[PDB]
């Protein structure tokens, strides 16, 4: 009711009676007048499945667009089902079968069989939802979708062109595609005596070497009838076929991004290997294209449009234990941290690469997390986790004295200048502290 | 004249008789030699219905794609026609098969019945318009369009392959590709004394078979002129089934559909086995997704592509009477709305999340323009729509007692807390008048 | 010599005898074991109209990638093109027919006949010059380009399967696919006593039958011979014919600026009309998204990687006469006015936009070339082309008083700050005569 | 062991091997129920071959993805093999051949001799492997191992076709593919006295022929066992045809080739009929577009991916021998040519054009790397290369009385006016050595 596991189960149970029932009807349809008494019991439990199917429908919960809720009044429930594909569904699992023989074998009753084809949409929702699915490769279920829509209208087709064969009388099976067919020695000559897995070998090769457009001529359309259905079915998968081709080509087109990664990173090699060598310079130019690697990390969270209020709770998650523990906010209050953490962004820094530079005006305010640094004025001073560097820049607006190099890989979490005052203003008491536990650690002596 | 209803009625019942004409003409020359009596009144009505098109074409519009303007004056709408492509119309309305029997049965006047097959490119002409809908994408279109063609042109295919077996006498009909056909049991002998719709069928399955590359072989072009020919439309129609092929791939290409949403799932997955986040905010962000894809997001659009200056009108126009009916703007004047209306970024909340907590200080001003919302302290206060909350946190400077849960889907317009404080600065005098409305309403 | 208009004549004399040569040739080797007298003329015209080339070449000028220069000494010419394919061009010009018959009729030296379809290489490179045409459809040209080698292909392939089949003796030409072929009424007994035309379109339309992979099968390979040559021919032509598709696919995906243009352009009403409508909201983004197509403009300018010294002479050619009559520069150096046309960026405004307002800092210089603009503070001055505005945030560094309103559609010209202090102090002296120009206009009383 | 090269030439002779055992097998399945004495020699030494190679590979190096580094641990070398197809390998070095006649020619275990055809993925790995050559583009590799795949599975399935007919008894030849087959005068009536290589030429014409979907009929499926093999190979090839056009339009999309010049030259026209630029400026800036693309072009390579601490390390790996030899630079110390290096940039200068002309000033500083150049006031000095010039200008203020005209191709690397007033003003004993070294040559 609440869509569990259970209705879930059913889902997937129903889904194997829609593959069968998909797959037997056009079988049942055209190879075909009436089933025999060995297969009367099997659609008895196929359209009792689907029977159970439709009374679970109205107890299963209601999904709306607009509003996206599970809403589980009774009265709305029903109703949604009786309007969309409810009397399809009773239609389906009407007993043909039985009506068809009780009529009087009236074959005119016996073409709303067809009406079964409706299951086979039942499975396409299935494939919609593996698409849905992010472990599965995408390309994988836009082929196998394909491949069954492909497989299920060749079935089809093969079925309904044994069909336009029996719609003749057996005295001019000499006009139909296939009791005109002779393959090597053997002659289908009175093709309705024949053992169905024959009849339905000899169709389906017919409707899958016309699939795929071999076209060997062996079986070919003789009558009007299965011309006129060539032509349609020819056409149709003429369309179907270049989706095919069409979709597995976008879907190559659209490569993964380590294949985009290496086109950028092999042109790299072919502009170093012309100019010059290096054991070092190509082991490290290698470094910087996987560290815009690590970079299209931060793109994914820039577009983040995520609501604030959840962003919030990511910087608060993450980003709050590194921050009360830099003695630059030693007595602080914890409002002003909330409102400091939401406003970092992450960013990465290679070994060997150089942040800072002698007496140069600075946009950024750094906080280290990971790694080491040091700062270069001889090592001034070896940089921990939870250490920030740059303040002087900020509250005194002197350029860093020191250069900044990387030692190793860090991950380093950046500031922006106009952001921080912002914060500083606002909280002016705050802004006290700050300088205070600036005083306290001196190593600057400027205010 | 001016493009009115009546000429895009016009334009849109010659596409019917174009549609007719474009696939009578090939039926006509290749299967009938003369057309009896009973069709006569049928094509001498469609050729009439194109004399008219012919006429009403000289008082038209006459658009000019310099100047992007419609020139009514009647000497310039006609001097445009007679230059461009109007004998070709002229020369289709002729009574070419009246013309035929009158001037003795010659097939080389009956060879230029085939001018009507410029009547197509009427109907090509209304596939180009069509791609110009916004509502059904410019590349289904030329799906569709590219379908017709090769429909079109395995109609105009048949009628070619059944012509050139008649272009030989009876006497040789076994050396045609029908004469010596033999289907099954049915063996097409004398294939001129065999009723139209046998012989079309029997052309079409041919024509239909090699448009699609099949190949079946038992129909096939015997003679030299129709192997020459079969070439030539073999030819023609690989390059046009490549057409198809690539039309259909930019189609995918371009739609990427649920890609979209797949490649996002991947970057947010990337961004969060990285970090250890917990379930339940796994969860909530997930969600999001969902919702981004299923509605199709507007944020996205509006960034997609607007300046500052009309983007405030896009905002004026969707988010003024929600505002303007805000209990806490009432007596305030306009353009301290009109600036406040700026500055709005819509969300979007899935029910079941929590905005505000207990002692929480927020930072964004929350109006809402959709769904139900509850102040939770039990439910304090359900929220209607046009009642703006959070104003205690940014105007008292203490954070909200009450949890404002969500349990309708709801539109949410954003505006931050510091860029309150900076309309209020300037604005003081209608800040006044805010905090009278709140003391008025507590 | 140089590559005047006379030799571009000749190359196009040439390629009309390629095309005849590289299609001549397969015929002739296939279809015929000598030629008759008729044809004795036309293949002395066609090796003395290739003889004259060869000596044309050698007075041909010396194109060389590294250098990119047009070397005229005789010497250096014909060494080039001796290593570079001089052999096979006079091997594909010895009268491989006359040698044919004078050494006794053997078919081993008529297999040197083949070497003439280098020639087909010849119109290849007219298709690659095509494609560097700007004016010409690159799609149009990559279609003829890839129809005529999948004709040639075909062309060629419907001479070798004929000549397959007269590798056997009359006595049994029931083992091959055209003495065995019976097409209708018509019989194929004695294919060699049929007429040329009858056999070579019987061959060609066996060819492209195969080269679609239609494949009716009336036509097929019956020998050893002939499978193994239609299994290399069906192999090539796969992969031949899927490059056309692949080649045919990807200049549809690389569609137009404009069809792209549409996409951004169509989505953005999807998202007002469902959200709203306006005779002039709809009129605005459109000049808005047109306004991007003429920005679509500025990014060719940004790109431009042409040499600084021609990009130099550019703005010197464009924005000097514009420069040189604003009332701000006047008495100025045309120095000093040299160093100033080079760095400014075109930049245009709709009408209705706004550019400034009231008391904000000012991040650029803009100068009016084209259009109206206004001075709202009611209008306080209405601008012309060559008045300039913002002088007052750049050399007072005081925020423009007075907003600015766009009117009619304006080429404006932006001039960044930093760029043009940098300037002035270098120029000490033309920062007098641009303040005591100022003085003189006054309207602004600050300095 | 240490993947050396004795390793990486036996991983070389194994593949030749894996070619010879990949496409004989099908083979030996297919026309041959029992090997012949003289290709028992033959198969034996492949079996034997690959056995070594089964030892081997116990013997050489473990690569793990997550440390990225080569275990060489016997025993960590060991177990991964065994768990990792190791009885596959094994169980394809069985004599399958000598176990079939031994057991008493059973054609159930002659089935099993199928598991060969794992040695085509050895082929593959090889093609997986030339991928990661940057010399070859891993799409135009794709596309050969694609074109393999294609006439690999075309070869097993001719042999499997093949197969389908030698299951029926001789009696029933005429219900085969091959047995009721009659191609011209020859009838392939008992098709087992046929020699081999007809009946596998006849069998691989049937198998090419549907590969390409071209499907003669001549040769096709008549028994209801070769029905269902054809359906499924034609249905497995399907989707391998689409791959191969999926991964040419890849190749093409990706290698823009003269597109990327195509695009270039559109933009640049836009440019430039807006401006009505004169012909003498439209033919320079259009031949270095040409240049641009000839020899493909290095800025934007550069620009394309680097930080500046490692792109001055670019430049100085490629730029300083060139300016430690300039004259002007004569006596000066390295940190000053150091700084200088990490701000010149590349310029090339197509033959025929004008640098500088008379009484112009200049602000770019020109070094030449190749090239030779002519000052003309008559030609004042050929320039060679390591020879600057502008030095005039950039220092004195005073612009160049000469021209420096091009009449060979020529590297120039530019340095700004601006920047070197910087470097001269903060290395001012530098600048003096510069004045000095200036003197001296004039
Ligand atoms: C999924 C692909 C194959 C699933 C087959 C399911 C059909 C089924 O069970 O019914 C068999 C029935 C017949 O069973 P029967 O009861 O006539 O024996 O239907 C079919 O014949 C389906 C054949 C499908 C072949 C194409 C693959
Ligand atoms: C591109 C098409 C150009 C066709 C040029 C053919 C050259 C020629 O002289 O053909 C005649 C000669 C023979 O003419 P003939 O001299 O034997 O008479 O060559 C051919 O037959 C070429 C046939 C090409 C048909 C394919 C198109």
């Given at each position: 009711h609440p869509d569990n596991r259970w209705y879930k189960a059913w889902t997937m149970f129903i889904l194997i009676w829609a593959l069968y029932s998909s797959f037997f009807t056009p079988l049942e349809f055209g190879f075909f007048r009436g089933l025999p008494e060995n297969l009367f019991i099997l659609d008895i439990a196929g359209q009792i499945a689907f029977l159970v199917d439709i009374v679970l429908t109205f107890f299963v919960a209601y999904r709306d667009s607009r509003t996206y809720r599970m809403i589980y009044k009774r009265s709305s429930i029903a109703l949604r089902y009786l309007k969309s594909t409810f009397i399809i569904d009773l239609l389906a699992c009407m007993p043909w079968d039985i009506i068809y023989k009780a009529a009087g074998e009236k074959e005119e009753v016996r073409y709303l069989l067809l009406i079964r084809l409706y299951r086979v949409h039942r499975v396409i929702l299935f494939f919609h939802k593996m698409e849905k699915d992010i472990r599965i490769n995408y390309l994988f279920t836009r082929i196998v979708k394909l491949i069954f829509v492909e497989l299920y209208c060749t079935h089809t087709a093969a079925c309904i062109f044994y069909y336009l064969a029996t719609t003749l009388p057996a005295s001019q099976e000499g006009y139909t595609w296939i009791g005109s067919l002779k393959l090597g020695d053997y002659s289908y000559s009175k093709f309705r005596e024949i053992d169905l897995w024959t009849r339905y070998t000899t169709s389906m090769y017919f409707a899958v070497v016309t699939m795929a457009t071999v076209g060997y001529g062996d079986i070919h359309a003789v009558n009007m009838r299965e011309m006129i259905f060539a032509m349609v079915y020819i056409s149709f998968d003429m369309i179907?076929?270049?989706?095919?081709?069409?979709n597995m080509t976008a879907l190559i087109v659209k490569g993964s991004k380590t294949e985009r990664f290496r086109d950028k990173m092999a042109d790299?090699?072919?502009?170093?290997?012309?100019?010059?060598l290096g054991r070092n310079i190509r082991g490290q130019i290698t470094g910087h294209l996987r560290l815009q690697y690590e970079s299209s990390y931060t793109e994914a969270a820039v577009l983040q449009d995520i609501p604030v209020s959840i962003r919030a709770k990511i910087a608060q998650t993450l980003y709050l234990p590194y921050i009360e523990k830099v003695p630059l906010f030693r007595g602080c209050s914890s409002e002003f941290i909330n409102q400091i953490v939401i406003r970092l962004h992450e960013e990465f820094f290679l070994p060997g690469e150089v942040i800072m530079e002698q007496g140069s005006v600075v946009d950024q305010l750094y906080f280290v997390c990971h790694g080491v640094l040091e700062e270069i004025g001889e090592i001034v001073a070896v940089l921990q986790p939870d250490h920030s560097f740059g303040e002087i820049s900020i509250l005194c607006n002197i350029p860093q004295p020191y250069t900044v190099r990387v030692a190793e890989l860090c991950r380093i979490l950046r500031l922006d200048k106009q952001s921080f005052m912002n914060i500083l203003e606002?909280?002016?008491?705050?802004?006290?502290?700050?300088l205070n536990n600036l005083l306290e650690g001196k190593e600057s002596n400027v205010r």
């Open positions: 179907l076929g270049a989706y095919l081709i069409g790299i090699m072919r502009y170093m290997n012309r100019n010059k606002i909280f002016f008491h705050d802004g006290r502290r700050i």
